[PDB]
């Protein structure tokens, strides 16, 4: 910062990203794993190698904290090992999921201020910080991470909680449907590495569809959507028909088997339950988000569904960057670096006079 330097930590679902404020890249990124004896409570390479006497556990599951001790372990091991700095000279920005209950947030600020002892702190929604990187202060964000997903409306520094739509579909459901469609075709799954290599195959080689009707119509007449993969393990699998239908599960939800809503009806229901006066002002610039951009092509779908959603009395002014995956990170990094943003930061004095619970009030 300028007075007392800020620090930014984004604990994602597939990885932990930590770093200093005013840094474009994160200073350290390691995978999301927390050890336990079946060496102990490690984040990084040793825990992944020693999964024969280590228990694989993830700290954040859906946007909710499955084990609180797990979250404290990854937070403690992130601040002490992949940063190595004294907390007394560095306040930290913490992250959370949109529409998180107040008791969870009170416990989170309480546990960071007492069992870890920060000077000052902040707890942030991820999607609003992602919007702050695209320069605007208003917009509807369609956020689909690797396990965390919401369509969040926000307009002028405030989000309507009634219209923040929590979404089942995520990278969790992505790999679930990956393994399901592969065993449905006929493919053996027996361990963690087969799940990892199938996720890598969807990340690198897989076409991200635009309709189900159109690409299947071109593939039924002549399959020109086949992409060859010749593996060195000794396996020859190649099917172009499966790979365009595999990310189709967001278009119509019954492709996965999921009860929950589809993506177009979700963004429709969110803009309908957000204010009428803010609607066109929201559409004056719509924003892209989501870690699901690892194959680019979902961006075209995001612009396409937002063209069809909002009424076109204007050419769509949607901001579509390839900063979409790390948008949360760079948002936290750019906001926390500034000195005026220390007025939105919560101090120790405020924690003592009004309790921790004011974190639900001051930030949302």
């Amino acid at each position: 910062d300028d007075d007392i330097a800020a620090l930014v930590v984004d604990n994602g679902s597939g990885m932990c990203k930590a770093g200093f404020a005013g840094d474009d890249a994160p200073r350290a990124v390691f995978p999301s794993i927390v050890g336990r004896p079946r060496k102990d409570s490690y984040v990084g390479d040793e825990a992944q190698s020693k999964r024969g006497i280590l228990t694989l556990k993830y700290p954040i599951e859906h946007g909710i904290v499955t084990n609180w001790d797990d979250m404290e372990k990854i937070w403690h091991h992130t601040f002490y090992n992949e940063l190595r700095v004294a907390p007394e000279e560095h306040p930290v920005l913490l992250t959370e999921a949109p529409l998180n209950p107040k008791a969870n947030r009170e416990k989170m600020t309480q546990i960071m201020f007492e069992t870890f002892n920060t000077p000052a702190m902040y707890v942030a929604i991820q999607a609003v910080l992602s919007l702050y990187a695209s320069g605007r202060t208003t917009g509807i964000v369609m956020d689909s991470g690797d396990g965390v997903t919401h369509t969040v409306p926000i307009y002028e520094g405030y989000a309507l909680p009634h219209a923040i739509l929590r979404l089942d579909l995520a990278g969790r459901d992505l790999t679930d449907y990956l393994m399901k469609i592969l065993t449905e075709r006929g493919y053996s799954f027996t361990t963690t590495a087969e799940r990892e290599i199938v996720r890598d195959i969807k990340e690198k080689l897989c076409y991200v569809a635009l309709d189900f009707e159109q690409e299947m119509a071109t593939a039924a007449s002549s399959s020109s959507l086949e992409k060859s993969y010749e593996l060195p393990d000794g396996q020859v699998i190649t099917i172009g028909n499966e790979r365009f239908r595999c990310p189709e599960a967001l278009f119509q939800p019954s492709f996965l088997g999921m009860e929950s809503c589809g993506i177009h009806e979700t963004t429709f229901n969110s803009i309908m339950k957000c204010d009428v006066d803010i609607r066109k002002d929201l559409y004056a610039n719509t924003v892209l988000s989501g870690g699901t951009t690892m194959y680019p092509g979902i961006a075209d779908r995001m612009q396409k569904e937002i063209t069809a959603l909002a009424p076109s009395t204007m050419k769509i002014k949607i901001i579509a960057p390839p900063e979409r995956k790390y948008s949360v990170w760079i948002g936290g990094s750019i906001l926390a670096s500034l000195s005026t943003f220390q007025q939105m930061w919560i101090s120790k004095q405020e924690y003592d006079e009004s309790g921790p619970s004011i974190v639900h009030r001051k930030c949302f």
């Binding site: 320069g135 605007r136 901001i319 960057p321 390839p322």
Partner: protein, 158 residues
């Protein structure tokens, strides 16, 4: 990549000085000023309001040329709204100015000499430009004949 077109925009405005830590801080000022404004056919009409301001100080057919090109641009509207924001960036001949000595059609118009008085200022602007060029040449050398050492010299810092 929109997120890079703001990073390229701060590169043109950044001249020689670093220039790799300044580039990161100017990438912030680009976004940090985008939401200051949000907190606190009428497209071609914005040109005609400047076309009026052309014609009052003379230069009529030049303003008639400006309106032929907005006629083909509306036969792109998001570009002009940035162009009208500044009308000056300046300092802090033709035979078809007046056709009276050549041409084909000429009804005899006598004299006015008001045409000649805006033809004498066509001359006097040249005498004021090629003199101020030489005034920034004698300034550059009287600022070196006169000074004390330490004004802007890097070798006195050694």
């Amino acid at each position: 990549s929109i997120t890079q077109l703001f990073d390229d925009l701060c590169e043109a405005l950044l001249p020689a000085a670093n220039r790799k830590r300044a580039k990161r801080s100017l990438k912030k000022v680009a976004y940090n000023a985008l939401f200051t404004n949000l907190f606190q056919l009428p497209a071609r009409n914005k040109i005609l309001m400047l076309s009026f301001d052309l014609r009052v100080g003379g230069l009529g057919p030049k303003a008639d040329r400006l309106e032929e090109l907005v006629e083909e641009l509306e036969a792109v509207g998001s570009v002009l709204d940035l162009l009208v924001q500044l009308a000056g960036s300046g300092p802090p001949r033709d035979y078809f100015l007046n056709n009276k000595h050549v041409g084909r059609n000429v009804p005899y118009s006598g004299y006015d000499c008001d045409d000649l008085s805006v033809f004498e200022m066509d001359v006097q602007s040249l005498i004021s430009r090629e003199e101020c060029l030489c005034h920034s040449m004698i300034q550059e050398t009287l600022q070196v004949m006169e000074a004390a050492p330490g004004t802007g010299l890097p070798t006195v810092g050694l």
